[model samples]
Target: FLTAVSSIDTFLPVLNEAKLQWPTSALAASSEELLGGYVGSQFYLQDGKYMQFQIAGSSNRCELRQMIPDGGSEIGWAVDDGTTHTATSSIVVPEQVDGVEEVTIMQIHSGEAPQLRISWIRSKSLDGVAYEDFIMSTVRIGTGDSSDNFVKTHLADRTAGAMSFQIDVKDSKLTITVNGNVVVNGQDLSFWDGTDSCYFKAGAYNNNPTSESATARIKFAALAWVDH
Candidate 1:
């Protein structure tokens, strides 16, 4: 089949922002507890920290998911031996006070949902397309809401900074590149019928629940994987 290359860009506590792991809705704090402090490895998210999750309904999320180690097919067989998911971030949509709330920094997920089964977000009002208030620096994948499961590209042009997104699954074809261009090429997203297995999430997934205490921020520095 294939080989290996599981890269974990050394940043943040491997897994420990002091407890809290799904089974409800929202509150997955990190960035040293509610993102808003850190330098060396970059960590900064606003409003009550931001690394929450839950996607299927009853919106409530702030993200940072990396469950691709095993579902990576142990180092091969990721859809016939070919997979590559990357995430490097810095997405901030601040300075707007008139009832603020609506976010989605980055997300790349494939199947498995139980409200918080994991994966689905990328925001700043890019919801359900049609401009959606036109923020900037964008790239969204699944669940634009209603499993109409929208898709919108166009990254960079300022809206805060730092980004290098990607998703490249083979055979069944599904490629989306950012920062280095290629918006969303190939495209087809088989939707993982082989018993779903895909996960690579970035931070801040707040999509308006009356702002849910408002204040969304994202700042990841690196995340890369490969199974070519």
Candidate 2:
């Protein structure tokens, strides 16, 4: 049996989980309220198999922000903390609005910008066919000091169905795996050397502005953030 909606804590079980950057509101709200299928109604349980996240094309985001483990704190981890941190999820993009080219599904954020991102991008093949490609975007070192200094690479085609995704940071190196295959292996993360207060974010973050009526939707079958 499944309920219409329940608290995100029921799924993620992370301490102080919240929606701090939802397009529906400017204030931070508890994940319990956000995932209850009320308030913004953007985050919710779906058919007892996945967590559905929806957002308008013009909307900035509908993401779950992670905080410290205890509770009621905004502090995050530093990249060079000498510990291994990882975030893993099984996800899919079931639909996207016309003209919507990209939607971020996961992120490693620092201060006010994203240091790294896993996104789904609409791309054209050599035969002039459109398909969704899973890609990784990372910021470069000594750039303009923002997330705009991106280096993007295609990881896989997401047209088939849901796949397992993992982002691991160990000893300041980043690794990304899809369906148990390593796509990005031990990439240097020294670009974010001095940056702190870093955290992880997951869910649909629309990357393009489109008609208000058009929306982007993503689903996650499983999600976890852990340290080792």
Candidate 3:
């Protein structure tokens, strides 16, 4: 029911197509990595093309520039490879917490209204977040970072159930629900206006769990009001 090797295998069809590198366990293992559809980002790969940013401690600061041309696995905000590792009970917003950045959700065509139910369970610690502080976000993969380009929101779950997402474009609405209840809603999901490479991912901020990570088994279709 879950992955045996790497979460990369959970998304193997796409990862294989993209061509990537990983660890030994990433090859074949007993336990899986994540629960969401996928959390792969070619743009974040070491040799990938993308710039990441981070927010240091309340006192740690870095230089800023006019948007680094959008290329390379380059990270701005702090040092060359910026990291926002912290242990706390609050949401530590990075300096450039812009656009919708989360697990890259790729909606498959399923013939139904309730098309997709995706979630992630955190068992390990990454960056500085913990497993208990799980937050999910839906964003476009391999593209620009702009408001007119993407819409994003985060949802914190209490490991009770999978996070329900109502994905709809063209109707100017993107709603997400937790345990069958609407938690977050978007105003203008003009996501189909210029591009359509969307992805979903589950993450934790200050609750990285070692014994068990946030994992969920999901299945459903992704619909569009107008044909995207």
Candidate 4:
């Protein structure tokens, strides 16, 4: 029963190991201390099926940064480097604690900045009921100007539980799909040119860490990245 409860076979095989970043330290998923069922308060296995990521509302992040082939360095790729890159995951944001209005669920990062962000935003229905929704935003490169820094679009609703997201970049074009539906289809990404050292990040990175007493929980049933 213990074997069944801790198996990680359900997760898709990833090309690279994840370097998990919690509040204070970073640990590789394959590390001896984290390879089993649970690790402290930030990470744990959920019924041998999903990987649960939890972080305090006051904390900055609990995310997984995709590492290169050797698992020693951050993976970096370029949009115009004659290579196609993709990242896909099946995720569930179970709850967003009070004082937390948004959390970044996925990102395409270049150096210290993010070129794109896939996030969950807290919102209200027409009837004043509260829920969360998914949004994708593309961040402009270079320019310190804030006017056109972000281009955002809503993709899914709270009722769409356990959403699947895919980010594909090829031939200077970007495509995004949610639940197998093309939301951002063949959008030109020329605006993101000249930016190298790009990589993928997933899990929960809270935007408003205002409540120290509460926490945000996110679950990942599958995660994979490929270089073609």
Candidate 3's residue-wise lDDT over 1-228, tens digit each? Answer: 322212232322222222111111033111112112322321121112111112122211111111112222211221111222111011122212222122212221112111122323233243454543344543432135554333333455434322334433324345554445666565433333332222221111112222222221112111111123
RMSD of each: 16.3, 3.8, 16.7, 4.1
> Model 1 off-target regions past 4 Å?
1-41, 45-63, 68-104, 109-191, 195-197, 204-228
Report the lDDT tens digits of candidate 2 across residue range 9-64: 44646423545467743645665544444433576677666677788856578787
Clashing pairs in 1: 34-49, 51-62, 52-62, 55-115, 104-122, 104-123
Per-residue error (Å), model 1, residue 153: 11
- Whole-model lDDT values for every prediction: 0.39, 0.71, 0.26, 0.69
Candidate 4 or 3, higher lDDT? 4
Residue pairs with backbone overlap in model 2? none
| Rank order (by TM-score, best first) | 2, 4, 3, 1
Q: Which stretches of candidate 2 lie over 4 Å from their true place?
A: 1-12, 15-20, 31-40, 124-133, 142-148
Candidate 4 residue-wise lDDT at 205 = 80
- Cα-based TM-score, every candidate: 0.25, 0.83, 0.29, 0.82
- What order do candidates take by lDDT, descending? 2, 4, 1, 3
Q: How high a TM-score does candidate 1 get? A: 0.25
Question: Model 2 misses residue 29 by how many Å?
Answer: 1.2
Which candidate has the top score in TM-score? Answer: 2
